[PDB]
Design a protein around this ligand. Structure first.
Ligand code: CLA
Ligand code: CLA
Ligand code: CLA
Ligand code: CLA
Ligand code: CLA
Ligand code: CLA
Ligand code: CLA
Ligand code: CLA
Ligand SMILES: CC1=C(/C=C/C(C)=C\C=C/C(C)=C/C=C/C=C(C)/C=C\C=C(C)\C=C\C2=C(C)CCCC2(C)C)C(C)(C)CCC1
Ligand SMILES: CC1=C(C/C=C(\C)CCC[C@H](C)CCC[C@H](C)CCCC(C)C)C(=O)c2ccccc2C1=O
Ligand code: SF4
Ligand code: SF4
Ligand code: SF4
Lengths: 73, 80, 73, 739, 40, 163, 73, 141
């Protein structure tokens, strides 16, 4: 119970950090003030980050499901 | 009680006016375009927020946007 | 329900119950203070996720405690 | 009335095979997005949208139907062929009870061969559950040579069917006048197809199905049987079996039909040997049925000028409360295909549901009741087919209201008056669903709560606050005591489900009386609740398809559209298409319960091995006590009968264990489509297009996310497939490994 | 015939020939040198 | 050995698993006659099973306490203890095949886009061109580093962005 | 234990991708160049442009919770 | 138009038996809408709420509870029968308002009298971020 309760809360708290991190970009983000800094340079090339993340999930998902199926059969 | 704003990129197609059922959009003369027409939104109190108009707009990006907001009896489409 | 079935099916249904409440001989004397309408789009995503997560927790908690308690090992 | 054809309308060539999308004006341009691909396979067979001409729509339909027959006939010939060359029919015919059927031998590759189980009869292969072996025995079939010919006939007739579709469309295609001769079609379909069709079958049963199954049931070996053709040639042979054949048609033309009492009978009940209906009774049935359809075919006045006129019959049945009634329907039915399709689907689906109930209680083909896997598979199949077909009526009726509805023809008509009190229909029907779900499903929760609290005396059960179905119980006895009074010439009753004694075959019971109690009261009501609601979703979509208070103009938007917009608080899933998409899940849920009811009831109260001291049912008769609680349906049905599927690894039933899991994967996979929306996906593809663009490897056909309507369709498809395939694995593995 | 070859060059047909090749090749590669796991 | 794993030849559970899987077939073989086809099918499966077990032992595999073979992934331990064919060598075999699919599809995309109506070339392929590229991709690594060192692999800020 | 750890990694990487996307694409997308003007949580931009249902950053958090529960499961 | 046409509350209605899509308690309490038009012959047309009805030669009048129900009918008459309808808004107090051809010319045709409303002189986009207006309402205005 203690291990499961902490693990389930961990995910809920972690989801809030991103979500409340997304609200910052809408409401409390000023591009002209934060120009050339790390925060704008991340937002500039986001197509690369989301692309690499997608590749990791696809490769991890295809291989993990495959090994499980190959052994099920 | 919705908000309807039209932007500088209108070209006087009139397709927004023909589409929206509730007669919330009309054409007004203007000197910015070839057609010498521009839209307008005088009566947004009758806007049901259907958003059909935006679909009619055939520009790269919409010269007409319906920013949803506070609701009302007319906006919710309540016959009762 | 809230995840699969959207709003438009329901608002047409509530319009039908409204007709009956007014045409009934005695119930029509009673009238709501606030008009009844179906739940919004974003509200249903939230509500259905709550009914979805609570079942995803109450089910396991019973299985976790009962499986481990009955065997005592 | 006359024949009317137009010669060589269409040239035959592969020019349009190279140009996909020719049928539509929008698609003939070509693809610039990948959405053009989905629209292609979707709008392919929507002939009403291609062109306004009703004539061309009729030519296309009448020729496409010739394709489904050819597709069926090679499928049917495949079963006959695969049963001839890769089966154990000749072995099963000599020992039906102990040997199991097998029409699908597998190849020897990695793994796989274990599926070729030890079926019996010097043969190993996949165990089938289609009942073909009992069908081929009901007819006179002893050898494999009779199955080979039967297969070659299907390929010959199928090519004729396919040839016909090219001929009736590309070369000589009928006119619209030929199609509107509806009165002519009814006489030919009733007398010719149903009448002579049944009269013909009687002939085969009388000359082959009776002279062969009599010897087989008397222990004679199949190889020693005289062949089906020889019986026709020698009037002495068949006379030894049925002496009435010596008189030869003189009894018929002299109107002394009592002489044919030997083979034309009204025995009723079942055969003690085979556990199936008396073959003599069926020849009597199909003979009777032919005379009934033959007179029916001489009703309409096609061209002779004598008979009824459909239009005069419809516009003459008028009433006060209805006003103008049934008037403008002959113009509807003769003009819209969707109207006829909706009516046909409603009865074609409700019939397959009747076939499912009238077969299990009245097993027609021999050695079917003892093959529990076969008897359970036919019921579950013909029932699912009925649910789909019924739901198609709600879809293919809403299309009529949107597309083929002209208010000019309908003024103060039946169709107009129904729309004008639609809010009363849906309102009164909403109250019933809430009434049922509370008083029916709430009873289940009451029993669960009472049991967990330690108050079993307060449950609804036999030892308890009994709610017994008196009306059903009275009907069982009435049909059981009918041979005495209401049907004196009947030797016995129609089935043993009403009442009587057990019929045992091979140590297994074929059928025995079914008792109805408190549980059978709750379930029968549970079905009504799931049926009244499934009607509410479809009927609401039909009446509110053309217009509503929320959206007074839906007909201009069309049949299938996702939503009018985020206004009015939200208008998503308001179309009639989205009502069908919802009715499917309910329809699937309703049909699934009507299947669990059949499995647990028949396992516990009916099926089982007969011993010297009574019968030992499979589940020990636990339907009465456990079914009243929902936990019983979780414990005694699911957590128990799932042992045969789970433990199937390492045996011939291993395929069901895989499909059992695979079906769960596809079911869940659907949830991605139903729960999410096309907005998140189209943005994700943009970040993917960047990488494909960065490397100069990008498609000229732009990638676009699945359409809202498609997303919903893709969900219910993968949803139903996973939900249905699970049972298909959870049943056949449970029942093939009997108990 | 020019249109027939064009029909055969569509996506559904070329994919059918690809599938028979790749599946036929793999099944044939399992039939001979049966059930491989380690590569020598 | 390594990681506390025994070789599959020396293991007892490995041979226990062989005697079990053969006993199932011998029991299944008793039902049928000697010269029948079901007998020939099961004897072949018996022959394959006996071959599967001895070949895995001969290949220096590592079996655990459960008796099933385990694979090792680090090339250092694989090469040191002679277990390279398991994972380390399967990785190069696949990458050559995966790269071949990429270098081929990338070339068909570029070349069809140099002509009129490239959209039609995707749904209606140019099979003579596709086979030409498919038999020219045997040396795909050479062309990649040729195209990387040249600079004609990647595009340079002529791509759409969103802000 | 090897396959279980790899399956987890797939869940953690994909869950971040669902969230990260809703954050970086919160300000704007090609389908909706100005999300920032509407807000964090809105229904959709309509059936136009092929369909815009579940674009907002709220709808990304909404979909991640399903994966979160799957990962912690 | 030249002048707003005042409402004639006593004109013949079409021949329609009735339905359940009619007016509810909201109409008597809050507001309702009525539409007028002039037909040259007797025809049949589809109602927004319910089924079919028969027009009458001369003026015709209906009562609806929503503006969309009225404009849905104008689009049908202007297209199918090529007529010129005009509809009003009636409150519970008896006040009347003339809505749709407010200038006499339909909105899809220009007229010199009209004045622009809610007209931003900028491109879509190209507007301040929400942070600049963080503590009052509106980024688009
Ligand atoms: C069984 C249910 C299920 C499954 C299998 C998936 C699978 C997947 N989801 Mg998902 N999801 C689900 C339910 C499911 N989801 C639910 C209920 C929700 C909430 C509504 C979500 C919400 C969600 C979001 C928001 C996102 C995903 C994403 C993904 C993908 C992540 C990348 C990956 O893992 O590579 C692949 C993983 C696999 C398991 C491969 C699946 C296909 C296998 C290999 C079958 C191979 C085909 C085979 C040849 C059969 C074909 C024959 C047939 C075509 C006839 C992935 C394919 C993320 C994504 O987009 O990825 C980038 C993403 O953003 N999901
Ligand atoms: C129609 C019948 C039915 C239905 C619809 C359900 C539905 C459900 N059951 Mg359930 N159950 C049933 C019958 C049914 N059950 C019966 C008859 C029994 C025995 C009496 C049980 C016993 C049971 C238990 C003990 C539990 C459930 C749970 C659940 C819920 C888990 C849902 C989910 O997505 O979690 C997530 C699904 C998964 C994580 C995958 C399922 C299990 C996989 C195989 C484990 C794989 C893990 C591993 C990492 C491999 C995956 C990696 C991958 C990349 C390959 C779910 C709503 C669970 C629950 O309460 O939810 C928390 C729970 O613990 N059921
Ligand atoms: C995809 C749809 C589908 C599929 C795959 C199957 C598959 C199967 N059916 Mg089935 N069937 C279906 C639809 C389907 N059916 C529908 C919708 C109905 C309702 C009419 C039936 C009625 C039906 C019956 C009554 C029987 C089967 C049987 C069978 C099984 C044997 C196959 C066979 O060749 O028997 C061939 C069937 C016969 C030789 C007898 C057919 C007698 C029927 C009553 C003829 C009626 C035809 C009539 C002109 C059409 C209806 C007229 C209209 C006015 C309603 C097989 C598993 C048989 C079986 O149980 O297998 C042991 C069986 O007796 N089917
Ligand atoms: C399409 C149905 C059909 C067909 C094709 C046939 C065909 C045939 N029947 Mg027949 N028969 C049928 C239905 C049919 N029957 C039915 C429904 C009955 C019950 C009344 C009979 C009762 C019957 C008798 C009693 C006899 C035949 C006989 C015959 C054969 C010669 C008849 C004759 O002499 O003239 C012939 C091949 C005769 C025969 O058996 O040939 C020796 C014969 O004596 N039939
Ligand atoms: C287990 C999940 C579930 C449940 C409980 C329901 C329940 C219901 N559905 Mg849904 N359905 C579901 C799944 C479910 N559905 C899903 C996933 C879908 C997606 C396809 C659908 C789609 C759907 C549609 C489209 C419709 C329904 C309809 C209905 C309602 C029918 C009326 C009725 O019988 O209510 C009776 C009440 C019950 C069945 C509740 C049983 C539990 C007990 C009786 C309640 C006990 C109350 C307690 C004593 C009070 C405690 C108070 C406390 C605060 C102290 C009902 C409330 C129909 C409807 O609403 O219109 C009539 C409607 O048309 N269903
Ligand atoms: C007879 C029934 C039938 C069926 C079942 C299909 C099925 C399919 N067609 Mg189609 N087609 C048909 C008839 C049919 N077609 C007819 C009558 C025509 C008119 C000539 C066409 C013309 C047509 C065109 C123009 C296209 C399709 C495409 C497709 C595929 C959709 C793309 C996709 O989802 O994968 C997506 C694929 C990827 C994301 C990567 C490619 C990897 C694929 C899956 C490998 C190849 C799969 C292979 C074809 C499967 C064997 C065939 C299968 C049906 C047994 C799909 C498998 C599209 C396609 O590209 O086909 C693949 C497409 O462009 N079809
Ligand atoms: C992230 C990947 C990864 C990881 C976690 C390991 C982990 C390990 N390697 Mg390894 N290795 C890798 C990639 C990896 N390897 C690659 C790509 C190569 C090149 C082919 C090698 C080549 C290699 C050799 C040659 C040896 C190891 C050894 C080892 C072990 C001792 C610690 C070590 O590396 O020295 C400390 C490293 C400090 C930076 C350890 C289990 C040693 C071994 O066998 O352990 C007993 C050893 O001799 N590795
Ligand atoms: C030549 C075709 C081609 C090429 C060169 C690439 C290349 C690439 N893709 Mg990709 N992709 C393709 C087709 C292709 N893709 C198709 C058809 C689809 C639709 C299913 C996708 C969907 C896709 C996704 C979702 C992602 C990539 C990603 C990537 C990048 C990482 C590799 C990867 O894991 O992708 C995944 C590989 C697949 C999904 C398998 C593709 C299906 C087959 C195997 C390839 C098609 C070959 C083609 C049909 C044959 C035509 C040959 C011609 C001569 C006829 C990489 C640069 C990832 C990325 O963004 O990089 C960071 C990523 O997330 N791709
Ligand atoms: C000590 C030690 C060590 C070390 C370690 C290290 C050095 C590492 C780490 C670590 C880490 C690495 C951790 C972490 C964490 C992380 C996280 C948790 C994340 C994230 C973030 C987020 C999620 C957020 C986002 C955002 C947004 C989106 C908006 C803007 C802002 C913000 C930020 C809010 C080892 C073990 C090796 C060994 C032993 C000793
Ligand atoms: C059923 C349903 C409704 C209608 C549901 C309604 C009107 C039920 C809400 C009212 C009832 C009376 C509240 C029931 C009481 C709750 C059990 C307890 C609430 C406790 C709170 C006060 C905290 C929607 O509006 C809807 C909207 C969008 C997507 C899906 C749906 C949807 O599925
Ligand atoms: S729809 Fe757009 S382009 Fe056309 S007139 Fe209106 S604002 Fe101008
Ligand atoms: S929101 Fe709807 S009613 Fe309002 S102007 Fe736009 S399209 Fe017309
Ligand atoms: S289906 Fe999607 S786009 Fe249409 S109204 Fe609903 S949320 Fe908006």
């Amino acid at each position: 119970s203690l291990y499961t309760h902490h693990q389930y809360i961990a995910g809920f708290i972690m989801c809030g950090a991103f979500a409340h991190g997304a609200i910052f970009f809408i409401r409390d983000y000023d591009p002209e003030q934060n120009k050339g800094n790390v925060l704008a340079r991340v937002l500039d090339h986001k197509e690369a980050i989301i692309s690499h993340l997608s590749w990791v999930s696809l490769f991890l998902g295809f291989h993990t499901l495959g090994l499980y199926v190959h052994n099920d059969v | 009680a919705h908000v309807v704003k039209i932007y500088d990129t209108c070209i006087g197609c009139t397709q927004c006016v023909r589409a929206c059922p509730l007669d919330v959009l009309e054409m007004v003369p203007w000197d910015g375009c070839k057609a010498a027409q521009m839209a307008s939104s005088p009566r947004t109190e009758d806007c049901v927020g259907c958003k059909r108009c935006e679909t009619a707009c055939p520009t790269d990006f919409l010269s007409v946007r319906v920013y949803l907001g506070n609701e009302s009896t007319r906006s919710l489409g309540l016959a009762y | 329900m809230f995840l699969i079935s959207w709003r438009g099916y329901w608002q047409e249904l509530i319009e039908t119950l409204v007709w009956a409440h007014e045409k009934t001989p005695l119930a029509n004397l009673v009238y709501w203070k606030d008009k009844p309408v179906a739940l919004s789009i974003v509200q249903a995503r939230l509500v259905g996720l709550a009914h979805f997560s609570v079942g995803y927790i109450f089910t396991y908690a019973a299985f976790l405690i009962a499986s481990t308690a009955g065997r005592f090992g | 009335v006359k024949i009317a054809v137009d010669r060589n309308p269409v040239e035959t060539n592969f020019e349009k095979w190279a140009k996909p999308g020719h049928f539509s004006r929008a698609l003939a341009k070509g693809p610039n997005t990948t959405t053009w691909i989905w629209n292609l396979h979707a709008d392919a067979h929507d002939f009403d949208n291609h062109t306004s001409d009703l004539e061309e729509i009729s030519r296309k339909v009448f020729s496409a139907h010739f394709g489904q027959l050819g597709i069926i006939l090679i499928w049917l010939s495949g079963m006959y062929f695969h049963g001839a060359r890769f089966s154990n029919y000749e072995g099963w015919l000599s020992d039906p009870t102990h040997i199991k059927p097998s029409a699908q031998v597998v190849w020897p590759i990695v793994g796989q061969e274990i599926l070729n189980g030890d079926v019996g009869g010097g043969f190993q292969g996949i165990q089938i559950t289609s009942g073909f072996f009992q069908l081929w025995r009901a007819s006179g079939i002893t050898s494999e040579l009779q199955l080979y010919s039967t297969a070659i006939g299907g390929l010959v007739l199928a090519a004729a069917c396919f040839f016909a579709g090219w001929f009736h469309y590309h070369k000589a295609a009928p006119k619209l006048e030929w199609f509107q001769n509806v009165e002519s079609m009814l006489n030919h379909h009733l007398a010719g197809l149903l009448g002579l069709g049944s009269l013909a079958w009687a002939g085969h049963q009388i000359h082959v199905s009776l002279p062969v199954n009599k010897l087989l049931d008397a222990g004679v070996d199949p190889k020693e049987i005289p062949l089906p053709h020889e019986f026709l040639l020698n009037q002495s042979i068949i006379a030894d079996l049925y002496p009435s054949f010596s008189k030869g048609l003189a009894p018929f033309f002299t109107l002394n039909w009592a002489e044919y009492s030997d083979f034309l009978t009204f025995k009723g009940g079942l055969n003690p040997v085979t556990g199936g209906l008396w073959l003599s009774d069926t020849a009597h049935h199909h003979l009777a049925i032919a005379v009934l359809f033959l007179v029916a075919g001489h009703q309409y006045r096609t061209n002779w000028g004598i008979g009824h006129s459909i239009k005069d019959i419809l516009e003459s049945h008028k009433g006060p409360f209805t006003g103008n009634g049934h008037a403008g329907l002959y113009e509807i039915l003769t003009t819209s295909w969707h109207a006829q399709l909706a009516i046909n689907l409603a009865l074609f689906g409700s019939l397959s549901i009747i076939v499912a109930h009238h077969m299990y209680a009245m097993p027609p083909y021999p050695y079917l009741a003892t093959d529990y896997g076969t008897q359970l598979s036919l019921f579950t199949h013909h029932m699912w087919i009925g649910g789909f077909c019924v739901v198609g009526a709600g879809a293919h009726a809403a299309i009529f209201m949107v597309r083929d509805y002209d208010p000019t023809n309908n003024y103060n008509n039946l169709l107009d008056r129904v729309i004008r009190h639609r809010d009363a229909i849906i309102s009164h029907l909403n109250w019933v669903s809430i009434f049922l779900g509370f008083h029916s499903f709430g009873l289940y929760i009451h029993n669960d709560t009472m049991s967990a609290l330690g108050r079993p005396q307060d449950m609804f059960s036999d030892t308890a606050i009994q709610l017994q179905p008196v009306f059903a119980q009275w009907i069982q006895n009435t049909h059981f005591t009918a041979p005495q009074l209401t049907a004196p010439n009947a030797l016995a009753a129609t089935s043993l489900t009403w009442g009587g004694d057990v019929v045992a075959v091979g140590g297994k019971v074929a059928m025995m009386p079914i008792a109805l109690g408190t549980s059978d009261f709750l379930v029968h009501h549970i079905h009504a609740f799931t049926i009244h609601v499934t009607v509410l979703i479809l009927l609401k979509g039909v009446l509110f398809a053309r217009s509503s208070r929320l959206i007074p103009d839906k007909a201009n938007l069309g049949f299938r559209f996702p939503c009018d917009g985020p206004g009015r608080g939200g208008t998503c899933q308001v179309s009639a298409w989205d009502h069908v998409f919802l009715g499917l899940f309910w329809m699937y849920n309703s049909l699934s319960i009507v299947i669990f009811h059949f499995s647990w009831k028949m396992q516990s109260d009916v099926w089982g091995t007969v011993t010297d001291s009574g019968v030992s049912h499979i589940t020990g008769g636990n339907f009465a006590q456990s079914a009243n609680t929902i936990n019983g349906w979780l414990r005694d049905f699911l957590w128990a009968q799932s042992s045969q599927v789970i433990q199937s690894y390492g045996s011939a039933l291993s395929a069901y264990g895989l499909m059992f899991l695979g079906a769960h994967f596809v079911w869940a996979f659907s949830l991605m489509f139903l729960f999410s929306g096309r907005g998140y996906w189209q943005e994700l593809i943009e970040s993917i297009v960047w990488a494909h663009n960065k490397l100069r490897v990008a498609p000229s056909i732009q990638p676009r996310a699945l359409s809202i309507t498609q997303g919903r369709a893709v969900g219910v498809a993968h949803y139903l497939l996973g939900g249905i395939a699970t049972t298909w694995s959870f049943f056949l593995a449970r029942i093939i490994a009997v108990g | 015939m020019k249109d027939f070859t064009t029909y055969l060059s569509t996506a559904p047909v070329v994919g059918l020939g690809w599938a028979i090749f790749t599946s036929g090749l793999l099944i044939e590669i399992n039939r001979f040198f049966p059930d491989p796991l380690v590569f020598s | 050995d390594i990681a506390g794993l025994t070789p599959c030849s020396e293991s007892k559970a490995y041979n226990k698993l062989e005697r079990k899987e053969l006993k199932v077939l011998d029991k299944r073989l008793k039902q049928y006659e000697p010269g029948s086809a079901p007998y020939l099918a099961l004897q072949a499966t018996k022959e394959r099973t006996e071959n599967r077990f001895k070949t895995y032992a001969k290949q220096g595999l590592l079996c655990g306490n459960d008796g099933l073979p385990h694979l090792i992934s680090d090339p250092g331990l694989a090469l040191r203890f002679n277990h390279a064919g398991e994972v380390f060598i399967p990785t190069f075999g696949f990458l050559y095949v995966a790269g071949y699919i990429g270098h081929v599809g990338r070339q068909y995309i570029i070349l069809s886009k140099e002509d009129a109506k490239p959209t039609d070339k995707e749904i209606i392929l140019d099979v003579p061109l596709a086979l030409k590229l498919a038999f020219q991709g045997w040396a795909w690594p050479l062309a990649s580093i040729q195209e990387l060192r040249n600079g004609s692999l990647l595009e340079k800020d002529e791509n759409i962005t969103v802000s | 234990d090897f396959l279980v750890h790899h399956a987890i990694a797939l869940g953690l990487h994909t869950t971040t991708l669902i969230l990260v996307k809703g954050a970086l694409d919160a300000r704007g997308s090609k389908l909706m160049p100005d999300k920032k003007d509407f807000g964090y949580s809105f229904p959709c931009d309509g059936p136009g442009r092929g369909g815009t249902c579940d674009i907002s950053a709220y709808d990304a958090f909404y979909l991640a919770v399903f994966w979160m529960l799957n990962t912690i499961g | 138009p030249w002048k707003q046409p005042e409402l004639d509350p006593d004109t013949p209605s079409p021949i329609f038996g009735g339905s359940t899509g009619g007016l509810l308690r909201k109409a008597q309490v809050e507001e309702f809408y009525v539409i007028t038009w002039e037909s040259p012959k007797e025809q049949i047309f589809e109602m927004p709420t319910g089924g079919a009805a028969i027009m009458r030669k001369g003026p015709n009048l209906l009562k609806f509870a929503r503006k969309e129900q009225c404009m849905a009918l104008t689009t049908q008459l202007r297209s199918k029968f090529r007529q010129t309808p005009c509809f009003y808004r009636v409150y519970a107090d008896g006040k009347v308002q003339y809505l749709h051809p407010k200038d006499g010319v339909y909105p899809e045709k220009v007229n010199a009298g009209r004045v622009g409303v809610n007209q931003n002189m900028r491109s879509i986009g190209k507007n301040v971020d929400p942070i600049k207006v963080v503590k009052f309402t509106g980024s688009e205005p």
